[PDB]
Amino acid sequence: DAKKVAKKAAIQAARRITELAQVLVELLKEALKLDLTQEMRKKLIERYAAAIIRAIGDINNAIYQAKQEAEKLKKAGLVDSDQLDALLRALDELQKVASKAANQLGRLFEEALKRLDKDNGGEEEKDRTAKWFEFEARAIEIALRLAAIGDVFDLEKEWRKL
């Protein structure tokens, strides 16, 4: 049913952003090790590039699956053409906010990396930048979860107005 479609897409998108955040946090703590050889540094960048690509692919896959389920509902007549419009617009918006969160996380991780390379070597002065990145990443996770629930909640309330 149309309500389960938007809900499932929202949970999946939020979940992929949480996976991305946890990887970037984990990669940034390894970039803190003083024994980090240039070999490990190359591998952390490859893991960061792969994590971003995976999040992009996985978020998009959830949205395409959701749109396909939405089109199945209107052809089965379980949803009229105005309700399909609303569900597709809500899936488009979820893709937008999830994609922004992914881009945000990538940019902040890059900024956090660049700061580590200009900061000192001791634990203090850039565990600060590590804590900061974790702090920003949690805020992005929470805001996306809030928007995902809130947007699905509002989709339901406006369906009745159709």
């Binding site: 809900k7 920003e136 949690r138 805001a143 809130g150 947007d151 509002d154 309330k157 107005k161």
Partner: protein, 151 residues
């Protein structure tokens, strides 16, 4: 409306704190305004249920210190409304503020409750009131989200 947004914040936070074992007093048309307060109370309950089912208990996900409390609140809220507003995100904003207040009290930072309430009223008055009024005011929310408002 300035103090009515403040009184909506205080009503909602008082309710959410009381559900988690606390009293607002520890830390601090009237007809139409009571319909808005009741509809927002019930909507936050429903929002927090859906959030817990989908993820886990909202309070259990939050961390705060008095030194980072303003940034914790503002960064989430700025991202929540970054690309726009709808009634569901406004409910999310209230539920987030209530859960942040409960977390603060739970961790012996009850001095933050009145601060969050003020930050919420300021964000409502400065950033959400134009949209709220443009969309028919809080009575439109009541018709849409109140559980006894339609047949």
């Amino acid at each position: 409306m300035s103090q009515s947004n403040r009184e909506l914040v205080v009503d909602f936070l008082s309710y959410k704190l009381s559900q988690k074992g606390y009293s607002w007093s520890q830390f601090s048309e009237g007809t139409e305004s009571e319909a808005v307060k009741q509809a927002l109370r019930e909507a936050g309950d429903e929002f927090e249920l859906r959030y817990r089912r989908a993820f886990s208990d909202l309070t259990s996900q939050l961390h705060i210190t008095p030194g980072t409390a303003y940034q914790s609140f503002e960064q989430v809220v700025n991202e929540l409304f970054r690309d726009g507003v709808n009634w569901g995100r406004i409910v999310a904003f209230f539920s987030f503020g209530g859960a942040l207040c409960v977390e603060s009290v739970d961790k012996e930072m009850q001095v933050l409750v009145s601060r969050i309430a003020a930050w919420m009223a300021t964000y409502l008055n400065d950033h959400l009131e134009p949209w709220i009024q443009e969309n028919g005011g809080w009575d439109t929310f009541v018709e849409l989200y109140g559980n006894n408002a339609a047949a």
